[PDB]
């Protein structure tokens, strides 16, 4: 590497020393990609080795085995695991690919070309070359469009993706006729983010999921070709700061928005994150508590429709803010919860009193593991449910884990976006190091009063 | 640039000659924060009782309905609403909107937008003054904490009724219930935040003492010792050479803070990173990640429970738990 | 206590963001010299900003 | 009704130090 006396950056800012070094920058990127794939393979092998087959895939602290299981690799009808060989194959393939990527990153970091323009003009790039940066962005956009179309191919032709909304409690269901309706997809993307709708966490079916993926893959490929064959317009030139730090800040803001968004998928979505693999969401186990106590107390003999609580609102059933019949407990906030074990019990007006009395299914009754433990409580050092629970059961929800972690890292990346956006603006302006001390701007301004 | 409408608007908005800088972040900060200020003041003065828990049991929170400054509070939104975005136009009447807790949603949404644009405006003034831009990065920690207690925690718990009440006794209520259900005192991020404010007060006292003590004579026992020279000279007073020697001799004279820039960077970074940590601790406990649970961790050879200070904290927490929302629970296990 | 933590954070950020040039490197920490008799940050700029 | 003791205490605690500070400020600004 280099020292501070030449680069001007200290050791705790050493990665800035390779801002203008294309080959070393590429080597750092490839080594980091090797790190990501190494974590994927190693953590996959760890979760496979620490997998007990009789338990569901959430009492064991497994977060990414559900990610493979959602694709339909080794998943039975009801949600059983059948075999762990696809998970093992994924882990081993990731480990070997990470070995290759780590070798390439180490090579380009240590003995690769220091700067790429003098020998490899296709890969050489200056940060002020807008056409070259849009070319690289177009290559990556086409790659991401192919990646989304890969999931589309898996859903459509390779007999995959697990549907929770399939009758009987879900099944690995090959998806036919995905909804490619532009009105539906963009009404998903432009709607309110609050409780009534949810902006992006509202997908209740794999048909809309795969239609949106078709749209995003086609758009990404087309935008990649567009960026390959265009140059940014003068309004974009006047609006953006064209430097490697500013581009990083743009990526940081976008990826922090993605981190918050993924935290919200993890907490609320039960379609792209099946309950059989990720445990209950926030709204369920709370809806399940009211549902199971309703069916238990009507199994004893007491009617649930005409039973009122201490406040006179209904111990089991009440009305929502809109006239829908919902569960009468404190779970009136979670009345928007849609689950595979609720919808056949639910009708047009409300919760279908007659269906609650007669048309309850034994599998919906057996789905009380949702309620029993596994409500997304759990404490930091494991232990059971609420903070006042005793050391009885070893469980924290995977949804809780990868929602909390993802919100933390999303907020940190928003902070990093702020830092890098400010420093990029100060670098383009010329005062990243401070004030010139002989002509400061303040002395050229009139005093406020 | 001078005879054009959007031009004159642009160099009036970005002008540094204003008493308060507006900017393009200020064009969003000013209306949202003025709306929040107006609605908060009017609600705090004359807000009718509002049913926070969705159980037809309203609480007053407003001075004209019989409480003082300490116990007055703009009460959070109804539990029956959830986080379902209830503005005035989604109500059939203003009385209904007031009974369901719409002022809290209005003030919280406008306050979140206003503090975000206040941070952006801090950056904008730093940019227009030729400054360095990380004062906004330092301000990102109270904004994170306010977002965690007004937006993120209601998102995690599923209802804006879980938001911190806009008051003092309501803040204490939010604190006690949060203790009962998440054990915040035994949360390491909260310990980091407590250490951060305690160390922030410590370092503020140390910096004030070292800079107020290390002086050469320029102010006498009167208002000023100008007898040497009056106002209008650049011959600087102060000291940081003897102050560092005093701080070194105070403990062991090797923890060197002789760099004033490094000292001020430490003063900036320590409470900011600790408030970041405690705000994210609140955000994690929003999704019920909770604190440390050491209840009945100590057992003897026969397996009897040996009591513990953590067990005493558990008893206090469950005593808080049985009091919270005396009438709002119908089922035993508290999940919503 | 809350105001003291606020004062510590604000003072540190303000001083670190008004640090003057005092050098040519990208690291401002080495731009500081205890021998010089000039202030290391711009109080006028800080006052106008706040 | 009316807590006249609290009213008198609050009114005096407002009036006396505010008037004292205002008198000091006026006599300071009168003689620069």
């Amino acid at each position: 590497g280099r020292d501070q006396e030449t680069t001007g950056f200290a050791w705790w800012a050493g990665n800035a020393r390779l801002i203008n070094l294309s080959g070393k920058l590429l080597g750092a990127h490839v080594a980091h990609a090797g790190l990501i794939v190494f974590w994927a393979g190693a953590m996959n092998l760890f979760e496979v080795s620490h997998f007990v087959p009789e338990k569901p895939m959430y009492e064991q602290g497994l977060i990414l085995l559900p990610h493979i299981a959602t694709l339909g690799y080794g998943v039975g009808p009801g949600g059983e695991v059948l075999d762990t060989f696809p998970y093992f194959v994924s882990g081993v393939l990731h480990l070997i690919s990470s070995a290759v990527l780590g070798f390439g990153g180490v090579y380009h970091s240590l003995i690769g070309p220091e700067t790429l323009e003098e020998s490899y003009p296709f890969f050489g790039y200056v940060w002020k070359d807008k056409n070259k940066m849009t070319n690289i962005l177009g290559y990556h956009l086409i790659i991401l469009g192919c990646g989304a179309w890969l999931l589309v191919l898996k859903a459509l032709y390779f007999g995959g993706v697990y549907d929770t909304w399939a009758p009987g409690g879900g099944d690995v269901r090959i998806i036919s006729n995905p909804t490619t309706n532009a009105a539906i997809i963009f009404g998903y993307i432009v709607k309110s983010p609050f409780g009534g709708d949810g902006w992006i966490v509202s997908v209740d079916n794999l048909e809309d999921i795969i239609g949106g993926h078709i749209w995003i893959g086609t758009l990404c490929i087309l935008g990649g070709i567009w960026h390959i064959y265009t140059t940014p317009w003068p309004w974009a030139r006047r609006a953006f700061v064209w430097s490697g730090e500013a581009y990083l800040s743009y990526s940081l803001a976008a990826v922090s928005l993605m981190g918050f968004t993924a935290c919200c998928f993890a907490w609320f979505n039960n379609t792209a994150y099946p309950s059989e693999f990720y445990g209950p969401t926030g709204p369920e186990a709370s809806q399940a508590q009211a549902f199971t106590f309703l069916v238990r107390d009507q199994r004893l003999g007491a009617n649930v429709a005409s039973a009122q609580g201490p406040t006179g609102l209904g111990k089991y059933l009440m009305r929502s803010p809109t006239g829908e019949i919902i569960f009468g407990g404190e779970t009136m906030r979670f009345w928007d919860f849609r689950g595979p074990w609720v919808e056949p019990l639910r009708g047009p007006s409300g919760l279908d009193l007659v269906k609650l009395k007669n048309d309850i299914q034994p599998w919906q009754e057996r789905r009380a593991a949702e309620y029993m433990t596994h409500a997304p409580l759990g404490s930091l050092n494991s232990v059971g449910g609420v903070a006042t629970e005793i050391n009885a059961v070893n469980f924290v929800s995977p949804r809780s884990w990868l929602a909390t972690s993802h919100f933390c890292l999303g907020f940190f990346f928003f902070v990093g976006h702020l830092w890098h956006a400010g420093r990029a603006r100060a670098a383009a302006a010329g005062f990243e190091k401070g004030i010139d001390r002989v002509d400061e701007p303040v002395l050229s301004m009139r005093p406020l009063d | 640039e001078n005879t054009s409408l959007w031009a004159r608007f642009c160099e009036w908005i970005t002008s540094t000659e204003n008493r308060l800088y507006i900017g393009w972040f200020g064009v969003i900060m000013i209306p949202t924060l003025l709306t929040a200020i107006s609605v908060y003041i009017i609600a705090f003065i004359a807000a009718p009782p509002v049913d926070i828990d969705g159980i037809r049991e309203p609480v007053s929170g407003s001075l004209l309905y019989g409480n003082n400054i300490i116990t007055g509070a703009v009460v959070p939104t109804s539990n029956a609403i959830g986080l379902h975005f209830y503005p005035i136009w989604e109500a059939a009447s203003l009385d209904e909107w007031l009974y369901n807790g719409g002022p809290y949603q209005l003030v919280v949404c406008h306050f979140f937008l206003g503090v975000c644009c206040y941070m952006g405006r801090e950056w904008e003034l730093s940019y227009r003054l030729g400054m360095r831009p990380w004062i906004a990065v330092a301000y990102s920690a109270p904004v994170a904490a306010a977002t965690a207690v007004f937006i993120i925690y209601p998102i995690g718990q599923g209802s804006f009724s879980d938001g911190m009440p806009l008051g003092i006794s309501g803040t204490f209520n939010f604190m006690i219930v949060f203790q009962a259900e998440h054990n915040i005192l035994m949360h390491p991020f909260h310990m980091f935040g407590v250490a951060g404010v305690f160390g922030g007060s410590l370092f503020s006292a140390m910096h004030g003492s070292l800079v107020t003590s290390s002086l050469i004579r320029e102010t006498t026992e009167n208002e000023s010792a100008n007898a040497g020279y009056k106002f209008g000279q650049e011959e600087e007073t102060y000291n940081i050479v003897a102050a560092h020697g005093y701080f070194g001799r105070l403990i062991f004279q090797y923890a060197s803070f002789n760099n004033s820039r490094s000292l001020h960077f430490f003063l900036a970074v320590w409470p900011v990173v600790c408030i970041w940590l405690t705000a994210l601790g609140i955000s994690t406990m929003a999704f019920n990640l909770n604190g440390f649970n050491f209840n009945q961790s100590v057992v003897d050879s026969n397996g009897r429970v040996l009591n513990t200070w953590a067990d005493i904290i558990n008893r206090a927490n469950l005593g808080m738990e049985v009091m919270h929302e005396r009438n709002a629970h119908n089922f035993p296990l508290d999940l919503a | 206590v809350l105001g003291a933590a606020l004062l510590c954070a604000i003072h540190g950020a303000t001083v670190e963001n008004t640090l003057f040039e005092d050098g040519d490197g990208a690291n401002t920490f080495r731009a500081f010299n205890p021998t010089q008799a000039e202030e290391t940050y711009s109080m006028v700029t800080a006052n106008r900003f706040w | 009704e009316v807590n006249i003791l609290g009213l008198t205490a609050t009114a005096l605690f407002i009036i006396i130090p505010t008037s004292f500070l205002l008198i000091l400020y006026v006599k300071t600004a009168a003689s620069e």
């Binding site: 005093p447 406020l448 009063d449 | 008493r19 308060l20 003065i45 001075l63 004209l64 019989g66 003082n68 400054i69 007055g72 106002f231 | 109080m43 006028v44 006052n47 | 009316v2 807590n3 009213l7 609050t10 407002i14």
Partner: peptide, 30 residues
């Protein structure tokens, strides 16, 4: 009165901070 005293004290504090912001003494020496 009860609420009137609280309102008077709050608006007095707000008026004080308004005067401090706008009708302050102009800053001198740095």
């Amino acid at each position: 009165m009860e609420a009137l005293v609280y309102t008077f004290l709050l608006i007095g504090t707000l008026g004080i901070i308004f005067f401090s912001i706008f009708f302050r003494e102009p800053p001198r020496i740095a």
